[PDB]
Structure formats: C-alpha cells, structure tokens
Design a binder for these strands. Structure first.
Ligand SMILES: Nc1ncnc2c1ncn2[C@@H]1O[C@H](COP(=O)(O)OP(=O)(O)OP(O)(O)=S)[C@@H](O)[C@H]1O
Ligand SMILES: [Mg+2]
Ligand SMILES: [Zn+2]
Ligand SMILES: [Zn+2]
Lengths: 487, 647
DNA sequence: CACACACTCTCCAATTCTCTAA
DNA sequence: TTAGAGAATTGGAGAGTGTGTTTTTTTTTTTTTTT
C-alpha cells in the first residue's frame, strides 16, 4: 500500500487465516463477557457458517464486525489499518472473501458454478468501527479514515448514474470496445483498436451503451439528542453506491459507517480552477437502522378462544386510561371494520369523540395511532405535520409541479386519527364531507384532474366551545360542527 | 518595471534576533518556548501562542545589556503576516527531537518523508524537496500586548486598544489589530488545503504545490526530471492522504449598538479562523478578536471586473471572550439568608410589590423534575395583569438573570429556512429554540398570531418544535419554560367581566398553564406613594433604594437546580394521600361555587401542584417534599386562583 | 482589462522511401 | 542479397487571433381576486 509501508500479501494472509478457524468465543472473551459458557454460538466457526449461508443464499455483502478483528491475535494491525486505510483494506478484504469462498467450494466438493461465483462481486460491511463520533468534531485529519456517524436522514436524492465502463464506437468501421473508467477520467483510445482501420479520433462515446453504477447522495442530519442546545444541528452528505440505495428512507434514524473523504469543487465550470475549500462527504460502506409465524397463528387461536377476548382487547386499547369502557369497545370495532363488499359501500367505522376537552381525547388518540398499522395522527386546526388534504405543491428544487397526497389518502385501510376536529377550516371540512361521502378525493388544479382513492377511517376528537362541555345543551350547540358533518 | 525603495527594517537582523529570543528567553523546564517546542515534538500540543508581553520583556531585558533588538513588537504590529513565516522558520530551525515514545500508527507524512528521502538518496550518490509548510504539525498565533500602564503605550500598541469595525480604516491593512464586537454568523468547518500532494502515474515522482489563493489550478503535468527527460508526459493525480489540510471557519463580527454613531447602521467584518482556533466562536458571543487585517483579493475575472477595490478579512489569532467553593458559599447564604423571601425581592428589586408573583417566578426559575413519562418538569406561568403594570420589567429581569433566557414579543418564534441565498444554509432557528434550557419571556402574549399560537402549543406539550418546509419534517428541540405577559384587550382589565373574556386567549391554551396570576393595579393612597418614592430614588441615585437583603448573583439558583436535579426528591406516600383528598375537596368546592368557569380543578392542576412541590423541595435540599411543602404549594395555587377573583 | 482553453497558422528533426551503396 | 552511403515527407510543439468570464433576481410596492 502506497504511503503506508504495508505489504498487501501479509494483510491478505492475516484476513485469510482470520476467515476460517475463527470462532465467536474469541469475541466472547475479548469483551470479558461472563456468559461465555455457550458452545454452539461461541466455539463454532462463525465466519465459516456465514460463508455457507452466503453459498446457500447467493448473497454478496458481509456484515463483518470490527471487534472481531481485535478478538483474533494477528488481525490487530489489520484492524488499525482498516481504521486508517479503509479503501485498500476493504478492497483486499473483498478479494480475500471471494478467493476464500471459491477455495471453500473447491475443497468441500459442494458442486457449484465457479464462473457464477467469480462473476458476482462480494462486499464486506465493517460496522461498529469505533465510538460514535460527533458530526461537529470532524477535524480535517480524519480525511480518508473510517468514521462512524449517527443521525436522522432529512432527504435522499434519486438514483444518480455514475459511469463505470465506457463504450466507444469507431464511426468509420463500427468497431466497439469498452474502456474502464478509473477515478472519473475518460481514457479514450487514441485510434481504432482494429489494425485494418486504426483511424485516430474516430471514437464517439455511446452513452446508453455504457455501464453505470448507482449513487444516492443522502443528506444526513445531526440527531437532536446530541446537538448542543444552542445552535441548530448541522448536516453532512452521505454517498451510497451499488447497494444500500433506498435502504434508508427520509425520516429514519441510522448509524452509518463510511470513509470521511473530501474532494475539490470547480469554481468555474468552463475552466479547471478549483476552489480551495474541499467540500466533504462520506463514502458509506454500511448502514444499520438504529431507530407471519405458525407460532403467531397459535397465539391468535389462543387469544381468540378466550371468553373474555372482547374485554381484554378493550383494556389493551388504552391500558393507561381508566373507565371509558364503551369508548375502547367502539375504537376496537373501528380497528377491524366491516367487510369490504364489492360489486360503493364504505364498510368502515367513523367515530367522533366529543364532550368537554379531554386529555384522553388526545392520549387515546396517540394510543390508537400506535396500535393501527396504517394511518397517521393529524391535527385538524393546525395541520402542520400533514396538510390533511391532497394539494399540488411547487417543490422549489427544480420548481416542478409535484402532487403530494394528504393525510386522508395514504391511510386506506388504516385509521386517520384527526385531532381538534372542531377548529379545522371550512375548506378542509368540505374535503372531509367528500371523503366520508364519496370515499375519494378529486383534484382539478394546475392542469391535473384526477381522483385519489382514500378509503380511510376517521377517528376525530373535537373540544367544545366555552370552558367545558355543557350536558344540558345539545351536542351541536356545544361542538361547533355542521350537522351534516356530525351525522 | 518595478522600482526600488529603501525601508529601515532589515529582516535578516530581525530573524537573528527572533532566533535569539526563541533560544534565550526564560520567563520569571529551561526556556519557555523551547519547553513549548518540546511539547509540540511530543505531539501533545499544536499551538505556539507567541505572546507579545514576553517579547516586550525580552526587549526590555536586553535594553539594559546592549539594546540588541530592533523593536520587534513594533515591527510585527506593522506587518504580522511576514513575521508568522519568520517565526515558523525559526521554529523549524530550533525544533527539538521528541523525548517520548509517541505512537506512530498514523505516520503517513513520516512515511512520505522517509520514502522520498530514500528514493532521492539511492541516486544522490550517483552510483528544498519538501515545502516548509508540509512538515509542520503546529499552528502559530500571536497574543497581543496586555495593558502597559507605562510611557511605552504612548498611543502605540495598536493591538492593545480594542477597536470597533467602523474604526478599522484601510490604512490598518496588514497590521495586527484587535476588534470588539458581537459575532453574528459563524460558518461550518471546512478543510482548506495548504499544499496538494499530486502523484504521477509514471516516473514515480510526486510534486507538491503550495497554495494560498482561495482558488488554484491543478498541475496535471509531470514536470519531474525523469518524466521530462523521458518525455512520458504523465498526468498528475491528487493524493488527499499525503496532502496537508487546515480546518477553516469563516466567522463574521458585527459591532455593538454602543459603538455606532447616531443615525448610522452597524457594520460587519469577516473573520477567518483556522487551525486550532476553530469552533472557539459562536453567534452568542461578545469577543475581542485579535488578528491580522488582510486584503482578500478578488482573484480571477471579477478581479479585472472591479479593480483596485479590495475586500478585507481579519485572520484571527487570539480570541478573548467578554460575556465546590460556590456550593459552600450558597450553603452559607442558605444558613444566613431566607431564600424564600430574599430571592423573591432579589428578582425585581426596583419593582415594588407583587411579592407572590416573584415567589412563583422563583418556582419557574427552578422548576420541578418529573422527566419520567407514563411527565414534564417545566413550569409555565402567565401574568394577565393590566396595562401600566410592570409585567415587562419583570420579564426583562427574569431574562437578564436566567441562563439561556430570551425575551420576545408577539408582534414584530417559529423558524425560517435558507435565509442567505449564496451559502444556502439549512434549518435556521428562531426564538423558542434559543432558550432551549432556559425561559422565553413572551411579552404581548395576547397580540400573537395563529401560526405562533400553534407553534407555542406544540412547544408547550411537546418540548420540541418542528417544521414542514419541503416534506423534511425536521424538528428542533425547544424545551423552553414559557413565561407569558398577556394584557387585557380594550385597555384596562375589567374585574366584573370573566377573566377569559378580558383576554383573547382560548381556554384550551390557558387551562394548560401550571399557574396563573391576575395582577392588576388599583389606585390606592399608600402603595402609589411608596412606588413614587422608589422610582424617584432610583432616578436620583442610579441604584435601588436598598432597604433589605438583595442578593445579586444567579449562581445560587444554578447550584440548586444542578444539586437537586440528580437528587430528584421522591414524593412521600402521605404526600400522595393528602394531595388526592386535596383534589377531591378542590373539585367539590369548584362545583359548589358554580362563579367563573375558569377554575374547575383539572388533572393538569394536580400535575402543576406536583411540579410546584417538586420545585420547592428542589430549592430546599433533597426529598423535602412532605406536608410542609404541599401546604405551601396548595396555598400558592389557591392564592393564584383567588387572584382571578380579586376584589 | 487577463489568465486559461480551444484552435487556426505555421515549422524543423525524427520518422519513412527509393536511387545508389556493399 | 546485405549493412549503409545518398533523396523525400509530415507530426508535435508553439506563434498567434480571438474568447470568457463576475453577473444578478432576494426584498419591497402596488395591483388584484378571494377570503
Ligand atoms: N411596581 C412597579 N415598580 C416600579 N416601576 C413600576 C411598577 N409598575 C410600573 N412601573 C413603571 O412602569 C413602566 C413599565 O410598565 P410596563 O410594564 O410597560 O406597563 P405595561 O402593563 O407592560 O404596559 P403595556 O405595554 O400596555 S403591557 C416603567 O416606567 C416602570 O418604572
Ligand atoms: Mg409592557
Ligand atoms: Zn475503426
Ligand atoms: Zn509523468
């Protein structure tokens, strides 16, 4: 390895002898774990079992852990070089994985296509590289060094195709050859490879006949529980290649491991002048989301055969709320709903929770929201989290006419628990009329005319007018809601 | 052509004097700077703070024995950028060898050193290569002269006088000056490249390129001797592993409102902190930044576009902030002074009366701790008051003493995104997030729109504000204690009218307030006289009419909260009983009274009672929650409820 | 404005060629 | 047919003519239709 005085051969041998003959017992004794009595889960060859699992499942990536290098004896310098020289280390680890798997195929006589195994690219994903480094403490000596980060992703750009293998065509003799691309440079041939033609400058790139990889820049955000209370959390830009693409949607919280790398940026596109600020990103190599069963069927039969199933479910709906026996019963029935008869018939339960302002009017709302699979908690008066209705937005970025669906839609089958149902606007009250009556939301705006299937369940909870509900006065005179909406 | 001029500075003599100073200076271990360089060689320190007081002392000492100096302090305050290089060169010459077993696990620079040295040596026998900045692992700064109080500072020592951004004229460019002002906008840390480490695909030779221009052009031409003589015309590839990077942060210092001449507008001045000074400046700072005021050039094309008009920045060198012994002191004050009746009057010494409101403000300042949920340890109070009553003065007094406290008005919170077009920053805060571990003093609470109504509602029962700008759904932690100062509409409060009718706040928001005080003024014969005497005495003597104990320091409250926060006073079972019968009888009397419906005791009143009792014990040692605490808490709650029924 | 890019105008010595060499 | 003296041509560096930028739509008024 250049700039390290480290031989690749010794590293490959170290990782090779680490692959087999290694047992999880070494890891169990590395961390001074008291419960090292286990034999099958510790003394067995963990990595050999993993390789067998890859062979019988045909997978590529490996969820290698960093501590396992410390557990073994000869792979301590290997671990330190992995932390210091992640690129070459990861490349040689992948090559060693491929060679070890083909050697295992050769040795165990488990017949398989050697060419198929050789063609497939096998990856390694070293996670738990070290302590949870802070985003704000990324001093510039961590360049090209493995970094562990924690945060919640803000957004994610679509797939960005990056060229891997070029494809030129001789525009005078129709000769085509592929030139591999290294470090994003085009090493176009000087002349035609065919000697009978050998025409210089006769090569034109055929863009759609090239080979492309997947790149997905992800804007990671510092987690709120670790940012200083004064300033707003900072952000860093991830980079995801050839895999793990769309493996972390916006809003997820993940622990990402990658090499902290910086690249120059061109001050002027036409010229080669480069800004001296070196925008930084990280090349992700593993993402872990820090955030159906026959036995399950048996459990369903066990709970269903119980005589007190109805009361048990009523209690489990809102365990922390006392009394409210019939309310929990109605909510439970709403969760199931009627049969979706077809030939339209709603086949769904809509429940409104009135009365004087109730903390449960909110607590049981969050409880049912957590219970229901689909649906989303939403406030009618505020609608800050979700607009509660489908309307066209100009997303600013590219300023395109993107149609974003409201809270009602996206909750088909689920329960769209509304809050502050009394204080919602009249315009969205009409949308509620439409969704509960027609079951669909129709939009005609900016040249887009369409009907969106809602098929949602409404569980609203509206506080009354005045200090508290008046039982003597009728519900209409207290809730401030149109009678057609209440019926 | 370039003319020639005669300047009496003699850089060579100055360099010799500099070397003598770095070798032969020992402050009243060996030499101080040799010890510092020894620490640097041990990789335990990477900041050579070249003090100017030391250089002045060195000059004064050698003045009595030969005057072997040329006024270095007056020679680097006139041109500091060159003397940074001179000091670095002198340090490289006198750099001691390490005297410790430093681990060299990450020795990429040393590996390049030995590799290139061996490659050069295998042909040198025929059987500087390294840029000076590349080998350096230290950053060199200047500490400005302190106060002289002598004839030496005869208007000299421009780094001693803290200037303002307006007084930084164009003739100070290149000098080592210091400015005083408030930081407003500090950028994120970016790696600024100092020298690139291009490597050639063939010829094996790597060529470095020093750069300080904010923009450069890659070489991409193997001009090495072997490559040129073989005419291989190899291309160069960057190697960030072998390159040298320095952390770069671009702050921006404004000027205080007291330094702005009448009718003018505050100016600003870009600051370029780099090296080990990074992350030492934050937007909520008032600092005396010392740096070299330098003309950043518009190098490129807008260069010819503009002309001689340069842009300036301050290369910061030294930042000086302005802004169990204490435990023993506050314990002794507890023994001597009665905190309950003393801190209350200490909050607003210049505000006469309203003592119980001040007592409640103490509970808000301390606040109970009930983080475990199943809840919250934030106390919120609203002062409906009356126009002409010093609610705003109380809010300002709370803000100026409460750590992480902010003051704001309803009409001018929330948040704004991407305010500057150029940098395009993300998720700028507001007013509630700033007082994260503090208090927000929302004056004019009634005159505050629906958007801020929803924002404060979210903050109040979530302790975290969120936005939905572009579907990001990001959120900002704002666990701020809320202190509102709404005032009645139609001017003066009407006691006859119902309290919620007098102020345009929905009962849903007000009912969630832990404690509420209606504190309106009444024309009397004696209270007004004492108030007038107090105010007029304040006008004469510029100081409060001290008539009782008036503690000033707020660190006692900080000690109390930090002390009892870990303690978390556990409530007694008898306490829980007495409060359950307290709720029973409170609800009973609420019914039997129903006059204004703004009272029906609600689970939230119980939670407020619990948190007030927790705060009271949190002020008094640990686990003091007993009948004594709950009696005072319920007395305060009942008094606050009665305040709504005053007169 | 001027530094860097793209490219027309322009030009000798190493590379090819065929008459006279061994 | 071989090792070596003569013609004949043209690609790779460089003289030079003309380019190409930096360069911007925020915030603040004024109008207009719905609300
Ligand atoms: N108890 C008091 N002690 C001392 N000064 C007081 C007191 N009450 C009022 N003041 C004086 O009143 C002025 C501040 O009153 P404010 O707090 O602005 O009244 P206000 O009720 O906030 O008015 P607004 O804007 O209608 S809410 C200062 O001049 C104070 O000195
Ligand atoms: Mg006021
Ligand atoms: Zn061809
Ligand atoms: Zn080269």
């Amino acid at each position: 390895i250049w700039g390290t005085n480290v031989s690749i051969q010794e590293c490959t041998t170290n990782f090779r002898n680490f692959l087999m003959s290694f047992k999880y017992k070494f890891r169990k004794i590395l961390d001074e774990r008291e419960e090292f009595i286990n034999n099958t889960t510790d003394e067995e060859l963990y990595y050999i079992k993993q390789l067998n699992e890859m062979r019988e499942l045909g997978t590529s990536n490996l969820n290698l852990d960093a501590r396992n290098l410390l557990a073994y004896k000869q792979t301590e310098d290997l671990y330190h070089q992995l932390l210091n020289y992640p690129q070459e280390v990861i490349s040689i680890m992948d090559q060693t994985i491929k060679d070890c798997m083909v050697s295992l195929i050769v040795d165990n006589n488990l017949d398989y296509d050697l060419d198929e195994i050789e063609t497939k690219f096998y990856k390694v994903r070293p996670y738990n590289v070290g302590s949870c480094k802070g985003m704000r403490e990324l001093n510039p000596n961590d360049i090209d060094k493995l970094i562990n980060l924690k945060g919640l992703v803000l957004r994610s750009t679509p797939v960005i195709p990056d060229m891997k293998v070029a494809f030129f065509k001789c525009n005078v003799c129709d000769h085509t050859m592929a030139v591999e691309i290294d470090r994003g440079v085009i090493q176009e041939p000087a002349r035609c490879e065919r000697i009978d033609c050998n025409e210089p400058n006769s090569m034109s790139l055929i863009h759609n006949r090239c080979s492309f990889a997947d790149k997905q820049v992800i804007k990671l955000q510092e987690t709120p529980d670790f940012v200083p209370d004064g300033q707003t959390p900072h952000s860093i830009s991830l980079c995801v290649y050839d895999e793990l693409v769309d493996s972390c949607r916006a809003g997820d919280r993940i622990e990402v491991t990658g090499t902290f790398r910086s690249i120059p940026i061109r001050a002027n596109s036409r010229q080669r002048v480069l800004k001296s600020l070196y925008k930084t990103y990280v090349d992700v190599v593993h993402v872990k989301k820090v955030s159906i069963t026959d036995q399950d069927l048996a459990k369903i039969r066990e709970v269903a055969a119980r005589e007190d199933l109805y009361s048990l479910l009523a209690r489990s709906i809102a365990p922390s709320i006392y009394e409210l026996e019939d309310v929990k019963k109605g909510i439970l029935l709403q969760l199931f709903g009627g049969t979706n008869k077809t030939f339209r018939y709603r086949g769904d339960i809509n429940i409104l929770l009135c009365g004087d302002p109730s903390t449960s009017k909110s607590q049981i709302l969050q409880y049912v929201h957590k219970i229901t699979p689909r649906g989303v908690y939403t406030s009618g008066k505020g609608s800050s989290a979700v607009g509660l209705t489908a309307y066209i937005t100009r997303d600013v970025d590219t300023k395109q006419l993107v149609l974003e669906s409201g809270a009602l839609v996206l909750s088909d089958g689920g329960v769209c628990c509304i809050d502050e149902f009394d204080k919602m606007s009249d315009s969205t009250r009409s949308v509620l009329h439409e969704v509960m009556e027609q079951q669909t939301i129709s939009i005609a705006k900016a040249g887009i005319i369409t009907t969106l299937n809602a098929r949602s369940s409404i569980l609203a909870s509206a506080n009354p007018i005045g200090s508290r509900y008046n039982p003597n006065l009728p519900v209409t005179e207290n809730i401030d809601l149109p009678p057609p909406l209440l019926s | 052509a370039l003319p020639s001029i005669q300047l009496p500075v003699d850089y060579n003599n100055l360099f010799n004097e500099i070397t003598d100073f770095l070798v032969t200076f020992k402050q009243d271990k060996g030499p101080k700077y040799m010890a510092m360089l020894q620490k640097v060689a041990n990789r335990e320190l990477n900041s050579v703070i070249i003090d100017l007081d030391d250089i002045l002392q060195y000059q004064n000492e050698k003045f009595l024995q030969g005057t072997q100096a040329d006024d270095l302090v007056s020679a680097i305050q006139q041109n500091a950028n060159h003397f940074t290089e001179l000091f670095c060169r002198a340090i490289d010459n006198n750099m001691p060898l390490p005297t410790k077993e430093i681990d060299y696990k990450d020795d990429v620079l040393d590996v390049i050193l030995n590799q290139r040295r061996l490659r050069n040596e295998r042909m040198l026998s025929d059987r500087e290569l390294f840029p000076p900045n590349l080998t350096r692992r230290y950053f060199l700064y200047f500490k400005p002269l302190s106060q002289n109080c002598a004839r030496r500072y005869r208007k000299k020592a421009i780094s001693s006088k803290p200037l303002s951004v307006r007084q930084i004229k164009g003739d100070f460019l290149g000098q080592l000056i210091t400015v005083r002002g408030i930081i407003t906008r500090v950028s994120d840390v970016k790696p600024a490249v100092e020298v690139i480490a291009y490597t050639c695909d063939q010829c094996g030779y790597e060529v470095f390129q020093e750069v300080n221009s904010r923009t450069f052009t890659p070489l991409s031409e193997c001009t090495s001797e072997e490559c040129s003589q073989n005419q291989t015309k190899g291309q160069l590839f960057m190697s960030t592993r072998a390159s040298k990077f320095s952390a770069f942060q671009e702050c921006k210092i404004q000027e205080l409102s007291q330094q702005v001449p009448v009718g003018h507008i505050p100016r600003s001045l870009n600051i370029h902190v780099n090296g080990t000074l990074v992350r030492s400046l934050s937007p909520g700072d008032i600092v005396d930044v010392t740096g070299i005021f330098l003309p950043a050039p518009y190098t490129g094309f807008k260069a010819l576009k503009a002309g001689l008009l340069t842009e300036t920045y301050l290369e910061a060198q030294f930042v000086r902030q302005h802004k169990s012994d204490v435990e023993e002191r506050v314990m002794e004050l507890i023994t001597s002074g009665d905190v309950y009746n003393r801190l209350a009057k200490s909050i607003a010494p210049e505000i006469y009366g309203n003592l119980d409101v001040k007592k409640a403000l103490l509970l808000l300042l301390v606040g109970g701790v009930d983080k475990r949920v199943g809840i919250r340890g934030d106390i919120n109070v609203c002062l409906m008051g009356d126009p002409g009553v010093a609610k705003s003065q109380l809010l300002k007094a709370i803000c100026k003493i409460s750590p992480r406290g902010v003051y704001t008005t309803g009409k001018g919170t929330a948040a704004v995104m991407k305010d500057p077009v150029t940098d395009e920053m993300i998720l700028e805060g507001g007013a509630l997030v700033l007082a994260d571990n503090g208090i927000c003093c929302i004056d004019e609470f009634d005159k505050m729109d629906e958007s801020d109504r929803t924002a404060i509602h979210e903050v109040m029962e979530q302790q975290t504000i969120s936005i939905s700008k572009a579907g990001i759904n990001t959120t900002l932690n704002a666990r701020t204690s809320i202190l509102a100062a709404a005032n009645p509409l139609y001017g003066r409060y009407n006691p006859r009218l119902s309290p919620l009718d007098n102020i345009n706040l929905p009962a849903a928001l007000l009912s969630r307030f832990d404690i509420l005080f209606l504190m309106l003024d009444i024309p009397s014969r004696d209270d007004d006289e004492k108030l007038a005497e107090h105010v007029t005495y304040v006008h004469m003597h510029n100081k409060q009419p001290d008539l009782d104990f008036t503690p000033v320091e707020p660190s006692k409250m900080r000690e109390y909260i930090a002390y009892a926060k870990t303690k978390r006073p556990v409530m007694s079972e008898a306490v829980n009983d007495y409060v359950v019968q307290a709720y029973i009888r409170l609800r009973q009397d609420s019914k039997r009274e129903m006059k204004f419906s703004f009272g029906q005791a609600t689970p939230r009143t119980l939670l407020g009672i619990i948190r007030l009792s927790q705060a009271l014990a949190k002020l008094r040692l640990a686990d003091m929650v007993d009948i004594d605490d709950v009696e005072e808490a319920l007395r305060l709650v009942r008094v606050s409820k009665e305040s709504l029924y005053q007169e």
